[PDB]
Write an enzyme that holds these catalytic residues in place. Structure first.
Site, PDB file in Angstrom:
ATOM      1  N   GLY D  29     105.493  36.071  38.893  1.00  0.00           N
ATOM      2  CA  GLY D  29     105.538  36.688  40.200  1.00  0.00           C
ATOM      3  C   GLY D  29     105.778  35.682  41.305  1.00  0.00           C
ATOM      4  N   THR D  30     105.691  36.190  42.526  1.00  0.00           N
ATOM      5  CA  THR D  30     106.119  35.487  43.718  1.00  0.00           C
ATOM      6  C   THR D  30     105.080  34.459  44.156  1.00  0.00           C
ATOM      7  OG1 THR D  30     105.136  37.131  45.179  1.00  0.00           O
ATOM      8  CG2 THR D  30     107.323  37.533  44.368  1.00  0.00           C
ATOM      9  N   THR D  31     105.509  33.558  45.032  1.00  0.00           N
ATOM     10  CA  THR D  31     104.628  32.541  45.575  1.00  0.00           C
ATOM     11  C   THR D  31     103.840  33.105  46.746  1.00  0.00           C
ATOM     12  N   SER D  74      99.775  38.507  44.256  1.00  0.00           N
ATOM     13  CA  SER D  74     101.025  38.157  43.613  1.00  0.00           C
ATOM     14  C   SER D  74     100.986  38.657  42.186  1.00  0.00           C
ATOM     15  CB  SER D  74     101.263  36.659  43.624  1.00  0.00           C
ATOM     16  OG  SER D  74     100.361  35.998  42.770  1.00  0.00           O
ATOM     17  N   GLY D 161     101.677  32.562  41.628  1.00  0.00           N
ATOM     18  CA  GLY D 161     103.069  32.736  41.275  1.00  0.00           C
ATOM     19  C   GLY D 161     103.577  31.594  40.419  1.00  0.00           C
TER      20      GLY D 161
END
Ligand SMILES: Nc1ncnc2c1ncn2[C@@H]1O[C@H](COP(=O)(O)OP(=O)(O)OP(=O)(O)O)[C@@H](O)[C@H]1O
Ligand SMILES: Nc1ncnc2c1ncn2[C@@H]1O[C@H](COP(=O)(O)OP(=O)(O)OP(=O)(O)O)[C@@H](O)[C@H]1O
Lengths: 239, 273, 242, 243, 238, 234, 271, 233
Positions: D29-31, D74, D161
């Site tokens: 997933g994202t930061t 996240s 993330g």
């Protein structure tokens, strides 16, 4: 058989012998003794990264103005036990009008662990405990628990991966002076014996932050802070 | 190979060494004795001189020890496989020997065979787990009942045997492929009486002897126990240097059976009444 | 070795799509639309002569003016029609007026979906789904003689006409060839017999099958054992002629 | 092997590997970060675009639970949102009680045991998310992070993330450079640096940023997203740190 | 093993084990004359130290016209009696008359398949003997099993070689066979089927029914050790 | 209990074979009378048959039943059927029809199909009797799937295949049973092919209007069976 | 290989003395005999009659008795082999030999064969990863591919046998090749009917007939043992010297031999 | 080869996946297309319909929620219906509790909070479809995307299901263009229609295989199906 709490083919419980070993995820050792009119409890406090707020980190809790406890296990599993303690003190005194002892309250939470071994909706908890308190009827005392229900007092004890390193070291002591607990009054002047014994028996040297402390003072329980420990560490100035 | 074959060195047993067994000889000799003793007699009717028979019963019996004596007083041959030796660690060795087997007896009509154990050729099941042994039970039964077996069944009767019965292939038995079976049970008490008369023929003008006074007591299964207690009874006399022997020295020998008659410990589980 | 509420890697469920061939074991059941009336037909699957086929009822009467015909597994569907009768009559109360068909039939296909998250706030009855499908015919005064089809997967279509069951994949082709707009009623009271005579395992009788029309003038009507027979001769009036 | 199939089945090692598989979901997933400033907290997150068709600034991933809080996450988008909807009513059922806002230790003491309850039973899914929250009480500043095994500890900063390895050593490279105290506005610059500095694990794609802080000083310790030139002041700056 | 469902060819997986399992259990017979009733049971154990004297295990009673015997678990049967006892006296506070059996079993054993039928719970490892009297059908005798089907009889066994033991009653039983002419059949029915032909009054347990009291009353008489001990001599054992 | 990919059900392609093991019974639809007939174990020794649960059972003054297959799963239905009988006589003040309770119990054998942890029955049954205030006979047949039919004759049990076709060489629609002596001759001239013993191995029963139920001795059977035991000769 | 094959010695097993059945047996004569009577009839409607059949087991219930009776009737060749005798230590010996029949079937248009109890050949297609035993699996493929590679069917006839099918035989058989998967099992009366229909030939029943009750009460059994039932009466005659033929001692054999093989008899539950 | 982590829902993968879900999202890949887009003032729904034979009527693809909302779906009807009947209550409840009528975007942020309450409990499947939501409020017009996952996003215009990449590509070719449109929905509508001809595997759209229904800053929800769409073909 190797996934649930039925009785084994031979008759142990494979899902439970695991849980004792689910504790040892941390490489952490703690200790318990009895004072003269007080008690003591301690454990390592590891911090392998730079960014924490060790103001926040803790295993040693506060349940009354009277008692305390400790943990060597996963803290999420601990907190569910931690919360259920605060509850089960109140409902006692609200029904009887006096504070919660230890001997009883372990005998409650020891009853509780059984009906996590007697059903299968539930995950048990991979922790153990060492409750500490004074008692106006029984005096300084502690009680330990397993996840099954075996609970027993101890004149003094410890826990972690390294019981053998010290638990022998303590039994050697009482075979050198031969009484149950120490012949020294103030809690401030007996914690030295604990920290004197850890690093010497098989333990490693410590610093200010490396350790944490609890004391079940008469009508008071509470933790300790940095210089309160550093001062008490500098008792070693003389020895 | 002819090692399996019959013997110019017959054993020396007899079907009057065999007390208690009184009726079975009359019930089983004739298929092995009479119409082969007199095929014209049988052929007066000529119903079917049947195929072999079978005997079931526990150990302790001497089904073997019966089958040793029948090879005396025969008029015929009595071959032996030394049971289960026929099989080897291969495939082709199976059927050839069975092919060799029948023909070895075709040349001798008045002649028969012996098995002791068919626990090792029983209850064929296969889904990948099994063995070549199942292959051989067919062809023998095939050459038992086929274009070339009844000519043996013209010439032959046979017998099988074991000690555990219902643990084999029922597809074996077309009754008529085996036309008769019998129980060799454990004995009666009084059936046990004449037994020890056989084997303890060692008393020396002694007296106070009550051979009936031992099957007085027994609740066993074997007859061989009559020997196991007898054979070690004399051991006492053998050690104490006095060849003679009596009842009581002969009686506590059952103390060896005090284990056997009492080795079966019991459970205390009153789960259900 | 599949379950109910579990998809596959292909997405095509197992059980419901398996429930879409149990119908292909059952009988035949056809209804065809004419703009002046609609028909219904059946194949009794009568197995023995002693039987009295008045008791076997593959055809029903919701009200004086609506009827349906169940196919596949005749047992279970005996339940659901009592649902429809409840919602019909119930709607005949709150409004004092016969119901549109599409207001009803959404309910029935809102029932068979109940095996997991039915309509808003539905406790999961129906451990398994209905192993049966059927046809609905009748008038309401908004669209016309809109036949409706139902299958337990939980959807409905509207048709001119088609079939089900045993003779499905083959028989409909003739129907696909031989329906149009400007035909009569009784031509459809007989065209089915050209078809059902194909896919019966024996010569037709007046008791193998039975019929029922439907009309905005009278309403609902089942025929008699004989009044099928008279038109069969009328079919043989063309089978013998041509 | 055969013990790694369901919740609440410990190992001979003494574990349930299933949540340890969850750690690789949240790894996918994202930061996202959030910093303990001198007087409050900060929030900033990665928000990657697939196509131009995605609108900017209508699809926030921060969530608010009450006035004096901001929370992000996240990994699993829905699952990290559920417990917020539990959060948004819990503290509301606590301001109900003594008529005062809720502490942050009250938050995790009323959450960090919740997700635990989704690891006791053989009938539910562990919340495959790592999660942050922060804000202010009477006592002062706070910050925390969560991990799907219930755990949580008070940090000065965090990261999730696939922006782990960059920021962690970077914050190790930050703190010694500035331990004296970092006020609110200044970290809003230095934060958005890191996300531009941490996209390099996924610089195949594009994104746009989203920031929020809350100061006892500035906003009366209330929660208030960013929307203005101040954001544009920082992106103009953060490009230089990567320049 | 999913108690509900059937075999692939119309059978059950569990329950055929159960009434086959109970064969492991002891013996309990029960007969009838046109005069009186007899019952018997051989305790699974007859070791000496324990309290075989007052060991009332195989034979319980329900009210003042009925007696039974038991075969199966000590416990899963031990609850049915406390159940069915209530269904007896709860017949009475409605109606105040005495209870008949033909309502009881038909209104009892239907509980059995209730646990074969659903819940995934196991059936009851139990079978019974019955005995009693109503004023409408005379003396009576009945039995049961974990299924629920009940059968009236004149004399029956259960347990070890009951199929064998039921033969032993086949030739000897008489229509007008009186009590003291029929009692001896029972322990003689057991004097053969025993494992330990070495026989002890201790090992078994006993019960009776008669109509001994004039004015048509009856007696739920149950017999103590030294009595049946001396009764045992009557047929001439020692 | 789910759907196979062959449109069938596992557990219910099985169950109805259970009834194909046990006893065998039948009834018919006479000119103006209706009858049943069923099976018993001869050689069942040391027993008195007065009190054993008969395969016949009664439900009202004017209707009866004859099960097969299991025996436990039979007893339950009569009870909750009896309820509906002596309840339907109350709310509506009229007695039952025949189809009503048949329509009822046709529904209960799927209320005990489609749910969690519930087996269907090892039972198949049929019924018989005259409606109140009418004359035409009515009989209906059942099986666990619920599909209730109206067979003029219906048998469920052992060796029943030819029995299912034996009637078709015997019965005639336009030549129905005249009277009881022949219609019961029909009732027995079917069942005896599987009897293979004397009269003791069966039990029968009959209905006529206004609840004219009868049950016939072992001896009455030995009156008529002889007449074809005499006419099984030429 | 050839040595065992040509077993031209049919016994006195008398086809049509056997009293078993008809429909099965026309089905084979229709399969075999009538095709050898006027096969133009198959040419009338243009028929390729079948390539042999396969009976089933139900042992001791009439597997073979017809077959040597057919051999008594065969009016052609007759062949006989065993797979266990066919197989050898070395690789492909028997498979090399298995080919050599069909040319020796190419010997004749009257070319037919019985086969002996396949249960150790072509049983089931286990992977046989466990060494050695793949020879069997290597052999069946040598046959079936030889069987239908390219064959005008050359009266390459066949009739097979076993005792249990579903135990084995998954894929070997195929229709057309063996269209007739057919049966033999107990009749449920006709063992009463025609068996002693045969055995009434010799015996006298020197006091009565008694046969109206020397009969079957739907008793599960196999009539093959009836040839014991005739036996032991003569023996029990001569257990008491009856030179004649009784009906009374005949009782025991069913009471004696049919009584051994007991069944559960759990039908106190389906009443 | 045979992932045993393919049974019930809750089981994660050894890599962080729910193989039920990922194997569900290909459903709509086996379902049809229904596209939609918007201006700053007006938004659209579109749907090919999928017909059974030459006789049947057609499978529907659009439903109105309420006077200021509609939607369109893809794949499954029945599990998708209930969500329509669901949120009607959560749009009536607004207009009776408050009368401050319903904002669109919270509906999605309600809707995502539904399905997640269906994944992490034994029993129950996802409401396995994708669908498209439209409408208008005080904030202008808005379009949405849906996944049975829970992910929902504010888009300019997008597409679904089979054959959709062809139409999907017109939008990136054209997102400079159609955003600046107002009060003139006719030419706007035929943007997608020409653009979804990119999908036609020679089925050659008709009077009746298409359904359109739109909304504006003025318009309540209207459907254009039946025979009114001779306008466009
Ligand atoms: N009546 C008897 N006469 C002679 N020997 C007997 C008699 N009863 C028992 N035996 C003894 O029993 C022994 C063998 O009997 P047993 O049945 O125990 O084994 P077995 O028959 O040799 O075993 P198996 O049949 O399995 O090969 C012999 O030593 C024999 O002396
Ligand atoms: N209808 C019958 N008439 C006479 N005898 C029969 C009949 N059916 C079976 N049998 C008897 O069964 C016996 C063998 O039957 P079957 O052909 O089934 O087995 P088999 O061929 O001997 O066994 P295998 O093929 O394994 O060698 C024969 O002795 C025969 O007397």
């Amino acid at each position: 058989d190797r996934h649930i709490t039925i009785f084994s083919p031979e008759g142990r419980l494979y899902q439970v012998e695991y849980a004792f070993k689910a504790t040892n995820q941390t490489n952490i050792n703690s200790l318990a003794v009895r004072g003269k009119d007080c008690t003591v409890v301690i454990s390592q406090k590891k911090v392998p990264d730079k960014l924490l707020d060790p103001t926040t980190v803790s295993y040693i809790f506060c349940i009354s103005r009277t008692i305390g406890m400790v943990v060597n296990g996963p803290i999420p599993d601990a907190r569910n036990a931690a919360l259920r303690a605060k509850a089960e003190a109140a409902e006692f005194r609200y029904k009887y009008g006096y504070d919660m002892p230890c001997d009883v309250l372990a005998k409650r939470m020891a009853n509780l662990s059984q009906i996590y071994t007697q059903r299968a909706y539930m995950r048990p908890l991979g922790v153990i405990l060492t409750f500490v308190s004074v008692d106006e009827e029984l005096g300084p005392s502690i009680y330990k628990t397993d996840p099954a229900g075996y609970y027993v007092g101890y004149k003094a004890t410890a826990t972690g991966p390294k019981q053998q390193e010290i638990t022998t070291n303590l039994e050697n002591h009482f075979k050198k002076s031969k009484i149950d607990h120490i012949n020294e009054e103030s809690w401030e002047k007996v914690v030295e014996f604990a920290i004197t014994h850890m690093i010497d028996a098989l333990g490693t040297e410590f610093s200010k932050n490396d350790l944490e402390v609890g004391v079940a003072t008469k009508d008071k329980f509470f933790t300790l802070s940095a210089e309160n420990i550093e001062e008490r560490l500098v008792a070693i100035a003389e020895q | 190979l002819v090692s399996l074959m019959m013997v110019e060195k017959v054993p020396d047993s007899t079907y009057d060494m065999v007390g208690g067994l009184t009726k079975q000889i009359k019930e089983i000799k004739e298929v092995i004795e009479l119409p082969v003793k007199h095929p014209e007699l049988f052929e007066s009717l000529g119903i079917a001189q049947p195929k072999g028979v079978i005997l079931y019963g526990p150990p302790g019996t001497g089904k073997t020890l019966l089958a040793r004596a029948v090879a005396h007083h025969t008029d015929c041959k009595f071959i032996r496989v030394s049971g289960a030796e026929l099989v080897q660690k291969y495939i082709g060795e199976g059927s050839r020997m069975v092919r060799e087997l029948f023909v070895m007896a075709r040349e001798h009509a008045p002649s028969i065979i012996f098995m002791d154990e068919i626990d090792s050729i029983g209850s064929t099941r296969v889904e990948g787990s099994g063995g070549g042994d199942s292959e051989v039970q067919r062809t023998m039964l095939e050459l038992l009942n086929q274009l070339d077996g009844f000519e043996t069944s013209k010439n032959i009767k046979i017998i099988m045997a074991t000690n555990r019965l219902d643990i084999l292939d029922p597809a074996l038995l077309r009754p008529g492929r085996i036309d008769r079976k019998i129980e060799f049970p454990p004995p009666s008490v009084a059936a046990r009486a004449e037994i020890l008369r056989i084997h303890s023929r060692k008393m020396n003008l002694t007296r106070g002897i009550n051979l009936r006074k031992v099957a007085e007591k027994m609740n066993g299964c074997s007859g061989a126990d009559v020997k196991g207690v007898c054979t070690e009874a004399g051991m006492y006399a053998l050690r104490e240097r006095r060849i003679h022997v009596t009842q009581e020295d002969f009686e506590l020998a059952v103390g060896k059976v005090m284990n056997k008659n009492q080795e079966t410990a019991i459970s205390v589980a009153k789960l259900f009444k | 070795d599949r379950g109910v509420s579990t998809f596959s890697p292909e997405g095509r469920l197992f059980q419901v799509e398996y429930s879409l061939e149990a119908i292909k074991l059952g009988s035949t059941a056809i209804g065809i639309a004419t703009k002046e009336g609609v028909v219904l037909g059946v194949e009794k699957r009568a197995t023995s002569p002693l039987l009295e086929s008045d008791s076997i009822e593959k055809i029903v009467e919701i009200d004086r003016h609506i009827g349906c015909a169940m196919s596949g597994l005749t047992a279970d569907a005996r339940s659901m029609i009592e649902h429809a009768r409840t919602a019909a009559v119930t709607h005949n109360l709150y409004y004092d007026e016969d119901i549109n068909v599409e207001s009803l039939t959404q309910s029935v296909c809102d029932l068979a979906l109940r095996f997991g998250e039915g309509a808003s706030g539905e406790e999961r009855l129906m451990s398994r789904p209905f192993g049966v499908a059927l046809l609905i015919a009748g008038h309401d005064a908004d669209d016309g003689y809109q036949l409706f089809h139902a299958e337990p997967s939980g959807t409905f279509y509207r048709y001119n006409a088609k079939a089900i069951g045993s003779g499905s994949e083959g028989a409909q082709a003739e129907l696909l060839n031989e329906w149009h707009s400007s035909l009569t009623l009784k031509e459809a009271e007989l065209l089915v017999l050209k078809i059902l005579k194909q896919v019966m395992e024996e010569k037709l009788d007046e008791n193998n099958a039975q019929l029922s029309c439907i009309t905005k003038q009278d309403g609902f009507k089942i025929y008699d054992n004989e009044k099928t027979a008279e038109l069969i001769k009328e079919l043989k009036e063309k089978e013998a002629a041509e | 092997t055969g013990y790694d199939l369901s919740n609440s089945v410990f190992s001979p090692d003494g574990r349930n590997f299933q949540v340890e598989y969850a750690v690789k979901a949240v790894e996918n997933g994202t930061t996202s970060i959030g910093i303990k400033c001198n007087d409050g907290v900060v929030f900033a997150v990665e928000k990657l675009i697939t196509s131009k068709l995605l609108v900017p600034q209508k699809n926030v991933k921060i969530q608010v639970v009450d006035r004096h809080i901001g929370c992000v996450y996240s990994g699993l988008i829905p699952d990290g949102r559920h417990l917020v909807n539990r959060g948004r009513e819990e503290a509301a059922s606590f301001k109900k009680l003594y008529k005062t806002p809720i502490p942050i230790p009250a938050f995790a003491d009323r959450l960090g045991q919740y997700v635990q309850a989704h690891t006791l039973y053989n009938s539910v899914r562990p919340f495959g998310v790592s999660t942050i929250f922060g804000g202010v009480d009477k006592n002062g500043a706070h910050l925390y992070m969560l991990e799907p095994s219930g755990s949580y500890w008070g940090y000065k900063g965090a990261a999730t993330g696939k922006g782990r390895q960059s920021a962690k050593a970077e914050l190790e490279k930050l703190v010694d450079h500035h331990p004296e105290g970092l006020s609110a506005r200044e970290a809003v610059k230095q934060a958005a640096k890191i996300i531009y500095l941490a996209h390099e694990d996924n610089k195949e794609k594009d994104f746009e940023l989203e920031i929020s802080w809350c100061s006892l000083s500035e906003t009366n310790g209330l929660h208030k997203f960013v929307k203005g030139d101040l954001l544009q002041e920082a992106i103009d700056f953060a490009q230089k740190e990567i320049n | 093993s999913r108690t509900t469902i059937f075999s692939p060819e119309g059978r059950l997986y569990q329950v055929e084990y159960a009434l086959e399992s109970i064969s492991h259990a002891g013996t309990a017979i029960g007969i009838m004359a046109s005069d009186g009733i007899v019952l018997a049971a051989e305790r699974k154990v007859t070791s000496t130290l324990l309290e075989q004297d007052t060991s009332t295990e195989k034979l319980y009673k329900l009210n003042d016209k009925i007696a039974v015997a038991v075969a199966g678990l000590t416990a899963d049967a031990e609850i049915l009696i406390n159940t069915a006892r209530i269904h007896a006296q709860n017949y009475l506070k409605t109606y105040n008359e005495d209870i008949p059996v033909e309502i009881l079993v038909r209104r009892l054993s239907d509980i059995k398949q209730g646990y074969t039928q659903h819940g995934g719970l196991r059936p009851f490892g139990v079978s019974f003997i019955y005995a009693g009297y109503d004023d409408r059908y005379g003396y009576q005798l009945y039995t049961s099993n974990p299924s629920g089907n009940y059968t009236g009889w004149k004399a029956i066994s259960v347990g070890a070689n009951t199929s064998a033991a039921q033969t032993l009653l086949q030739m000897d039983y008489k229509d007008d066979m009186k009590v003291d002419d029929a009692i001896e059949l029972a322990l003689k029915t057991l004097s053969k089927t025993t494992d330990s032909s070495a026989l002890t009054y201790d090992r078994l347990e006993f019960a009776t029914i008669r109509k001994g009291a004039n004015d048509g009353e009856v007696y739920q008489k149950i017999f103590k050790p030294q009595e049946i001990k001396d009764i045992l001599v009557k047929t001439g054992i020692t | 209990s789910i759907f196979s990919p062959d449109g069938h059900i596992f557990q219910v392609e099985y169950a109805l074979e259970a009834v194909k093991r046990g006893t065998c019974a039948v009834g018919v639809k006479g000119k103006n009378c209706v009858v049943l007939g069923c099976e018993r174990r001869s050689t069942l020794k040391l027993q008195d048959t007065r009190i054993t649960p008969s395969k016949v059972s009664k439900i009202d003054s004017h209707v009866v039943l004859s099960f097969s297959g299991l025996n436990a799963d039979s007893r339950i239905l009569i009870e909750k059927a009896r309820v509906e009988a002596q309840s339907h006589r109350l709310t509506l003040e009229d007695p039952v029809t025949v189809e009503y309770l048949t329509r009822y119990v046709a529904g209960v054998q799927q209320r005990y199909t489609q749910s969690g942890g519930v087996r269907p029955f090892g039972v198949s049954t049929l019924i018989a009797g005259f409606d109140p205030r009418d004359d035409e006979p009515k009989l209906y047949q059942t099986e666990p799937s619920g599909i209730y039919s109206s067979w003029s004759a219906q048998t469920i049990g052992r060796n029943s295949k030819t029995v299912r076709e034996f009637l078709e060489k015997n019965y005639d629609r336009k030549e129905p049973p005249a009277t009881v002596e022949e219609c019961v001759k029909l009732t027995v001239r079917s069942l005896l092919e599987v009897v293979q013993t004397g009269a003791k191995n069966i039990e029968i029963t009959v209905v006529k209007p206004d609840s004219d139920i009868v049950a016939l001795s072992s001896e009455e059977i030995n009156q008529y069976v002889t007449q074809i035991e005499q006419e099984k000769q030429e | 290989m050839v040595s065992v094959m040509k077993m031209d010695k049919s016994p006195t097993e008398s086809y049509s003395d056997i009293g078993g059945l008809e429909s099965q047996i026309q089905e084979i004569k229709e399969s075999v005999e009538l095709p050898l009577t006027h096969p133009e009839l198959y040419e009338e409607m243009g028929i390729k009659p079948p390539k042999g059949v396969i009976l089933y087991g139900a042992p001791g219930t009439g597997k073979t008795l017809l077959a040597k009776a057919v051999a008594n009737q065969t009016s052609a060749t007759f062949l006989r082999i065993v797979g266990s005798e066919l197989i050898q230590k070395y690789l492909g010996d028997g498979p090399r030999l298995c080919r050599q029949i069909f040319k020796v079937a190419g010997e004749n248009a009257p070319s037919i064969v019985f086969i002996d109890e396949i249960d150790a050949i072509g049983t089931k297609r286990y992977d046989s990863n466990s060494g050695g035993e793949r020879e069997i699996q290597r052999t069946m493929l040598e046959l079936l591919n030889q069987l239908d590679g390219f064959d005008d069917r050359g009266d390459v006839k066949v009739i097979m046998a076993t005792n249990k099918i579903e135990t084995l035989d998954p894929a070997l058989i195929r229709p057309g090749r063996i269209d007739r998967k057919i049966l033999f099992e107990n009749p449920d009366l006709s063992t009463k009917k025609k068996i002693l229909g045969i055995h009434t030939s010799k015996m006298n029943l020197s006091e009565d007939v008694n046969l109206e009750t020397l009969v079957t009460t739907k008793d599960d059994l196999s009539g093959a043992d009836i040839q014991a039932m005739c036996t032991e009466a003569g023996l029990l005659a001569l257990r008491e010297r009856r030179m004649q033929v009784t009906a009374e001692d005949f009782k025991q054999a069913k009471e004696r031999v049919m009584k051994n093989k007991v069944e559960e008899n759990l039908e106190g539950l389906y009443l | 080869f045979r992932n045993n982590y393919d049974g019930d829902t809750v089981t994660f993968s050894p890599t962080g996946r729910l193989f039920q879900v990922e194997y569900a999202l290909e459903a709509i890949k086996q379902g049809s297309v229904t596209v939609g887009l918007r201006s700053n003032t007006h938004a659209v729904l579109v749907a090919l319909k999928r017909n059974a034979d030459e006789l049947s009527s057609y499978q529907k693809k659009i439903i109105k929620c309420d006077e200021h909302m509609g939607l369109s779906l893809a794949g499954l009807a029945p599990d998708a219906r209930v969500l329509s009947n669901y949120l009607r209550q959560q749009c009536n409840y607004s207009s009776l509790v408050f009368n401050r009528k319903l904002a669109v975007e919270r509906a999605g942020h309600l809707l995502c909070d539904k399905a997640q309450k269906n994944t992490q409990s034994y029993g129950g499947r996802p409401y396995g479809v994708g669908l498209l939501i439209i409408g208008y409020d005080k904030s202008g017009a808005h379009l949405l995307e849906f996944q049975p996952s829970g992910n929902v996003t504010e888009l300019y215009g997008t597409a679904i299901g089979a054959r959709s990449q062809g139409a999907k590509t017109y939008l990136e070719r054209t997102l400079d263009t159609f955003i600046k449109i107002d009060g003139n929905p006719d030419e706007l509508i035929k943007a997608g229609v020409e653009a979804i001809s990119q999908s036609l595997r020679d089925e050659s759209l008709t009077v009746d295989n298409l359904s359109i229904a739109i909304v504006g800053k003025d318009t309540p929800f209207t459907i254009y199906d039946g025979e009114a769409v001779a306008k466009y073909i």
